[PDB]
Design an enzyme around this catalytic site. Sequence first.
Site, PDB file in Angstrom:
ATOM      1  N   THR A  11     -85.805  41.653  53.443  1.00  0.00           N
ATOM      2  CA  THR A  11     -85.539  40.420  52.479  1.00  0.00           C
ATOM      3  C   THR A  11     -86.730  39.932  52.130  1.00  0.00           C
ATOM      4  O   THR A  11     -87.516  39.668  52.925  1.00  0.00           O
ATOM      5  CB  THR A  11     -84.505  39.641  53.053  1.00  0.00           C
ATOM      6  OG1 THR A  11     -83.251  40.167  53.328  1.00  0.00           O
ATOM      7  CG2 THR A  11     -84.337  38.345  52.292  1.00  0.00           C
ATOM      8  N   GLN A  12     -86.814  39.568  50.732  1.00  0.00           N
ATOM      9  CA  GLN A  12     -88.031  39.155  50.295  1.00  0.00           C
ATOM     10  C   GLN A  12     -87.555  38.075  49.089  1.00  0.00           C
ATOM     11  O   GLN A  12     -86.557  37.761  49.153  1.00  0.00           O
ATOM     12  CB  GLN A  12     -89.199  39.879  49.515  1.00  0.00           C
ATOM     13  CG  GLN A  12     -88.901  41.495  49.997  1.00  0.00           C
ATOM     14  CD  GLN A  12     -88.166  42.191  49.281  1.00  0.00           C
ATOM     15  OE1 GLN A  12     -87.036  41.873  49.043  1.00  0.00           O
ATOM     16  NE2 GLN A  12     -88.569  43.219  48.552  1.00  0.00           N
ATOM     17  N   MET A  38     -81.709  46.585  53.648  1.00  0.00           N
ATOM     18  CA  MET A  38     -82.015  45.060  53.362  1.00  0.00           C
ATOM     19  C   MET A  38     -83.333  44.970  53.048  1.00  0.00           C
ATOM     20  O   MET A  38     -83.955  43.950  53.395  1.00  0.00           O
ATOM     21  CB  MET A  38     -81.491  44.342  54.674  1.00  0.00           C
ATOM     22  CG  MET A  38     -80.004  44.447  54.971  1.00  0.00           C
ATOM     23  SD  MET A  38     -79.161  43.602  53.716  1.00  0.00           S
ATOM     24  CE  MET A  38     -79.395  41.986  54.165  1.00  0.00           C
TER      25      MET A  38
END
Lengths: 250, 243, 244, 240, 235, 241, 111, 231, 228
Positions: I1-2, I107
């Site tokens: 995730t970013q 993800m």
Amino acid sequence: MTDRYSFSLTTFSPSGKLGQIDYALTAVKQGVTSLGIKATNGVVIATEKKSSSPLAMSETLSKVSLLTPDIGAVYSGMGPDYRVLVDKSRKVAHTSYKRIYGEYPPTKLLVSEVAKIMQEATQSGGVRPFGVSLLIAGHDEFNGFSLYQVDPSGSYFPWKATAIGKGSVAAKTFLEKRWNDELELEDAIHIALLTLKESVEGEFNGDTIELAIIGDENPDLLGYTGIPTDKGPRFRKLTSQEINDRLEAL
Amino acid sequence: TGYDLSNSVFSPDGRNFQVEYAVKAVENGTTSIGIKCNDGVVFAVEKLITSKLLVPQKNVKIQVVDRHIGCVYSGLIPDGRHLVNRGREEAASFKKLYKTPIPIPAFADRLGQYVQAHTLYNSVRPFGVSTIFGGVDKNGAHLYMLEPSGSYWGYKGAATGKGRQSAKAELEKLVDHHPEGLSAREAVKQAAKIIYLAHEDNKEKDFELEISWCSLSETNGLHKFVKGDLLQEAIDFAQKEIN
Amino acid sequence: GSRRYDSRTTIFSPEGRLYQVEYALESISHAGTAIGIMASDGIVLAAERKVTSTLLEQDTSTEKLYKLNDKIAVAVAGLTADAEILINTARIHAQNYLKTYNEDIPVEILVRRLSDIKQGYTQHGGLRPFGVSFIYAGYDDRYGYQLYTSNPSGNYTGWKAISVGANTSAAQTLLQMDYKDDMKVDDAIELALKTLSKTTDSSALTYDRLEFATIRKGANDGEVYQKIFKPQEIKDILVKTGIT
Amino acid sequence: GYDRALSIFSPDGHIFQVEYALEAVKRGTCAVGVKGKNCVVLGCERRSTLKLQDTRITPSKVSKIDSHVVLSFSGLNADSRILIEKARVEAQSHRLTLEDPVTVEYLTRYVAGVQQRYTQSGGVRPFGVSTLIAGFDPRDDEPKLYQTEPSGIYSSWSAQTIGRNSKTVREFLEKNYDRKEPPATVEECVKLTVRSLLEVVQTGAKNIEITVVKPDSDIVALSSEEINQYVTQIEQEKQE
Amino acid sequence: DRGVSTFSPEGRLFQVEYSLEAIKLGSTAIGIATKEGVVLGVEKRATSPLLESDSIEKIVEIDRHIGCAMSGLTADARSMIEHARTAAVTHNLYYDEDINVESLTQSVCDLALRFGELMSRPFGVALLIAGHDADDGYQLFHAEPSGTFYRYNAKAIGSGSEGAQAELLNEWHSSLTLKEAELLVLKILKQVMEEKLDENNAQLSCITKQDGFKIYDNEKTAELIKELKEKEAAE
Amino acid sequence: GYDRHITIFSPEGRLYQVEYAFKATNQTNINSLAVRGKDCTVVISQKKVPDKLLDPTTVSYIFCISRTIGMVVNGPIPDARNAALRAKAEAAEFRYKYGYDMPCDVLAKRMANLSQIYTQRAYMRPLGVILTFVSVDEELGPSIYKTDPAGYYVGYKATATGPKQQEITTNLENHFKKSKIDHINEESWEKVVEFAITHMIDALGTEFSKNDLEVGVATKDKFFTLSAENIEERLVAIAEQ
Amino acid sequence: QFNPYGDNGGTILGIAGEDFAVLAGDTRNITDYSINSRYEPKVFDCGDNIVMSANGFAADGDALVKRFKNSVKWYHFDHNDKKLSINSAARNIQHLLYGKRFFPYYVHTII
Amino acid sequence: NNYDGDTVTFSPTGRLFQVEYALEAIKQGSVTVGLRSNTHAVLVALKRNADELSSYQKKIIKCDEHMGLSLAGLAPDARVLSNYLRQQCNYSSLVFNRKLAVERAGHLLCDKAQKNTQSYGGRPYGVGLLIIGYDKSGAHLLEFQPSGNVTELYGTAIGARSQGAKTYLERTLDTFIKIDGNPDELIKAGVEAISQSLRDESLTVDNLSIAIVGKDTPFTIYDGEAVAKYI
Amino acid sequence: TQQPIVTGTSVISMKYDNGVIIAADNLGSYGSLLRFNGVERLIPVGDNTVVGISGDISDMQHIERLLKDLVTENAYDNPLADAEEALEPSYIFEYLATVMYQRRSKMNPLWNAIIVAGVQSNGDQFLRYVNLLGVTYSSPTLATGFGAHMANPLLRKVVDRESDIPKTTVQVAEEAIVNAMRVLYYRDARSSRNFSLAIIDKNTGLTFKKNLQVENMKWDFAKDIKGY
Ligand SMILES: [Mg+2]
């Protein structure tokens, strides 16, 4: 690739001999003579710096090595095998002792660790035994001064005095005559030099002999002052000049 | 004795016989050549027509690496393909990390180290190919030749396979009679001739000629196959010279 | 590839024997004799050092007799370095057991684990076996005083009196003759020394060529003490039993 | 890891390592199993070259795998410890998952499976061991006696023997054991087991061990004198 | 010595060819396929009379619609059976249906050449796999340690095989009833067996669509042996 | 006879594969030489380009390992480049981990340790090369350290390697027996290179053109190789004296 | 924080008759209050007389259908071109879905 | 001889005997023929039984709708390589929505086979394959050898006595290449080619296996009653 | 995730009778800062495909490098690399869509919205969308981000359904695209005046126009507006 030699290269023959260990000992027999003598107030270990060529700077090749501040080692046999064992011995003194107990190991226990490494090379997969015999001299608080021999098999024995390599049989005889339980360190050095002269062919001086002692604490070699309880290393390598000084009264 | 039964064993004269046996497979292969020119390189190879049933133009042997390197080889063809696949991975990773396309000398060492690694263990077999390769980078044209031992050097011209002796001699003449340079278009024609001349040693079967080239001016520094009119022209030049 | 150089340490002969185990036993037969004798009030371990030099430091040396814990000791016959690998493993097993159960490890359980380790080297892994035979002398509250032996095959057996190493045939005959069930430790000491004195390949038996140990209840009130003999103490017991 | 194929076929279709494992069994001390009408008896020879042995602590030849099943063997002693341990672990694992103790056949099938696995796995040699596995299935009074061997084949036996001179005692049992009339009592069955061993054993001293297993986890080892009584009673019927 | 996966100069795998020799030493097993069912029969070959013969299990259920008989090193078969049962049950779990007899046979044969320096050697056992499925009806396969499987109308494996196979060549035809097939297996087993055939040293089984795979009791086989004696003592 | 094929002891305590690796070291039929000045270390090597189809600029047995360390190899080129790549990786890693440039003698030890491992572990063959490392070390000054297939290494006042190493060695010994010092007492590296070439000419009894030699020079803070034209200038000055 | 799921709207309807079956669905694809496409087919012929629709999060729906079509293909290879019955397809899809029990295909499937 | 114990060993003349022994297994295999026009490509294979009670071993395997092969030699090796091909065709469709070019399929098989000729423990594949397919550049026929060598051809044959069919096709090349838009004639020519490899036995209804792929024709296999038309 | 850092805004596109058009501005925003002004977000692949990318620029540059590697790899051992076995828009799209869905399923998404525009071998127009979730769809008009809300309504007046495509010329289509870009410049706070436009026609091939500007802007009425 992958190392697919996962089997032993050292095995028992019908007569119960471990061939590779015997052959390793034969390589040690060809090796240059080295020896150790234990005195009441110290230990001395010595050997010949047989230089391969006169263009070689023989001071850059160290046959006698510091393992810990109070423990030193000399060898007979294959020099490269010795060099890597010294690297491993120094590291195992830290990883399996100093980082645990905050102090350097006693002589016998470091010898035990070196011996284990050499034993494993005699049973593990895809390796040959080390082709060296070591003489390890050292001091520790509770055992005092001690001298040990370690062989290719991983066997180790404590000695009052001994010699290994080329002219060991003759040198051991010489040491049996002279050794007693009242020797001071200077007397032991003198005997070491006399013994070593027999197995040495040509030049016999401070530049062709490597000699170290385990003796008194050297606070001048510690590198710092201000902690009374830290008094410095007992291992000291004699200089070329110090050896020549003792070769006159010889 | 028994020193030749296992790879990576030194004989008492200090030789690796398994590598020397790999050379025998190379020497048994079809002739392939490389010619370094003024601003590029030319590669050519002899394809033996085993039978009429081989579809012409369809069993391509020369192989591109990245977009600027050509590779041709003689010996065991699958070994050559395996080496080129590795070369492509090495070229891809180089460009990935460093952005610029891999320089030819850099690429040569990548293959060199990989081929050499297959002479270090008895668990692998040496490569049964000699590989001629090269192309154009930011420092100009480069031609290399790589042996089963992992040994390689830079060349002005190079040859391997069954007709290597004939081709070498022909290459030596070009080098002497053009000490200032050879043009890409000349080199294509000369390549055709030398293959036709080297075909004397594989005379039982007739053959198909295949040429490629990378030139800074003719191909913009990219590797391309010589097709159509330019190919036919070089075939004609070669046919007139054997009479 | 590598198969060519494999000796295959873990295979049967056509007769159904394990070559390497047989040859390891042949190696052990040239080692210094070790003897264990069990009495009703304790155990004796006696072992002969292999041919000594006058410059060997005896009082700080340990080649034959090793302490596994406070209640168990072993006598070694064979390759010393191989024995030390196994000894340290056994010492750790004893402490693992004590940590787990808060009780000292029963002698047999320790012996079985070491023997199982030896066995593994004969069935899998392609490595040479350990060239070592042990005599285990120990005490626990279940079976009391116990003697065991184990060899490179990983087979172990219990004994009233046993020898390993050189001249076991001769030594076993002599023990078989003079051993009695009601025997006491001080008699067993004398028997062990007399047996070594007769079976030795040396000219005579002296203090500097012996290692000696006892496991006695001889310790103030229901508890066991191990005594590894100093060189002077071996010299005294040699005089006291009239061998020098 | 060490991977060598040690057990492999020969040109005549034999696996020599498995066959040489049987030679190790042939050299081992003799073991015999006889099942009566309401019991199974396991008799074992002990080689008599060893005195000064301490029999209190010496590994016994018959081993309990669970409270209702036993295992004896002939061959390499160290090898048998590995099979016994595995069998004991599996017996407790079966109780834990199935909520029922193992049947004698299941336990036999397990041990036999282990032995077979060691005949076609890399880097291992076969077990130099044959076993006799005896007992009673839970809540069942029919006696069970199975045999296994290094190859991994297993089968049920009315009576069977393994180890050295087993040919001789098998000869004996083959003509002294009636399928129609199984040894109807403990005494009767123990006697037939002792007789079969006396064909081969030497002295009837502490050379013969006997273990009786009855239904519902009733297992007991006979001691020297109790066996000595059977030995005595047998020779007094012989001189006739 | 020499690799386990080595080819001979004739283009055959040594170890596979040697395992085939081990199978020739095995006890005889026969199978016959008909439009009414597939019969499977075996020679038990007890090594001694004290061995309780009903503990010899050489015919085995794989699923309700598939059975199997073995010949050779029968201990090697256990893991093959385990795999086959797992494959049959697994397929039913994934697809809510019976698995085809051929697909089962193919799954077993995939194990065969998984050996080298995986298991250390080929299997030393041959299998007859019999069963029924809706698409291809009653089927009999012969699975070898080479990884090859053949479909058969009738087949004999083991020590008395080519003698029995020559006999099956003569006797088999497309209109065989199930009962005729049973007698035929018994007849040919009796011919090639060393000892005299009876209900204790030979075993029968079959697989029908309606009742699935069934091993015959010794009482039912005894009846069929007596019926066989009477038919042959009648010309 | 399998103690001949892998690195295990023979009955006389010898490693034959190591001995045969020493023989491979002279396959190229090239001789090299290293000497020390006051401020520099010079290494020279014969260059032989037998085929006319070769690009002679790519034919080389001298390597720039780091900015300060140079290495000359005596042995086949594939093993040489294997050792060169490794030494470059080691020198770069050392600098990253410990924050200063890897000393010449330390790199020599490291490569010697790697070589030792090949003499003890069976699956790895020894490399058929002899490595001569040169630099001007910041602590020890001008340095020559040489490694062989046995895993042996030592420092040198000067050294020579190849088929005719003995002639060059004795020639160098005799000079230092005269001068009675550890080095060539010369300010400029140009003059130290001239000494090196001169004494090789005398020892080998052969004359050199600009394409017959390869020269590497180590100074404080960089090691570099001379072009054909820099060597020509060296040859010219030698002739005019 | 990254949300790996989304809602592409749509509605599907399957009705089973006496000797036939229908599977219908609108062709609109959306996110929030926007229209992505007025014609994005949602119901598919998967072979062997089977039709399928996986409604909800379109990326998961496409992946599932695509996997099932693949499963039909391999059923044919592995089982001699046997026709995959609707009941066997249903059981197979259960295993595809439950294989991602702890990171579900965010779809409502109908065949 | 001393150099044939494993695949990792060259002979002194530079040969790999284990690979040559693998090639020998193909020569023992039953004959199979492959040929193509510009519109279609055909495989014809003589199936071999064990005896008269046994079925005839299937020789032709479908890899995709547009590709498939025939085998000669070790059938389990063909199953491994054909399975690998199915996966690669499948990967190309799922990832790139692209039918795998027959030439790429050849290159992938070559590289898979090669790895088993250069490492210890492995063995070469013991099977030869004839791969037909119709892709974006028309009809194709490939010949795979377990040495790794893959070759694109107009026609060929492999297996026992393939030489007869291989010469027939070499004569007929100019004729059969032109059989465009007439599948039945292309098969006829293939059946006629495989007939030159027959001795003793002849083509029967459970003996013969035919496969075809082309312009508007998915890869399909004809066995049993379906080949009566061509005998 | 970013989280996306440096970003690009709308990409818009539509089909016309003989091909497709695609356009995107040359801005790389750093939040509300208009940091980078020379960013090309249309990447042509071969001469029959153009990939337009919005969202995170670092991920765009990564995708750019993947496509550049695709062309290299496709040419390996491929004599028909510039003919029958060249890369199709449909191949390039499916590859990207596979990657985007794989990355979201780990993800670790590529924070982009992508439109692949091109012309297939048979002359058919190709236009399809994919984003960071792996969601895909096709339509006669496609737009990302703000363009979806403002451009699509305008482009759909020209091509409202499939049957309107043959009736729409390249000049009407281009004019509609250029008008939409002006509207986005009026109303999108993260847009720029400068943009690139690409046309892929089945006859005239790929035309790539750089350094276009929004022109004919209506601002004059602002002078009359006073207060609030
Ligand atoms: Mg080595």
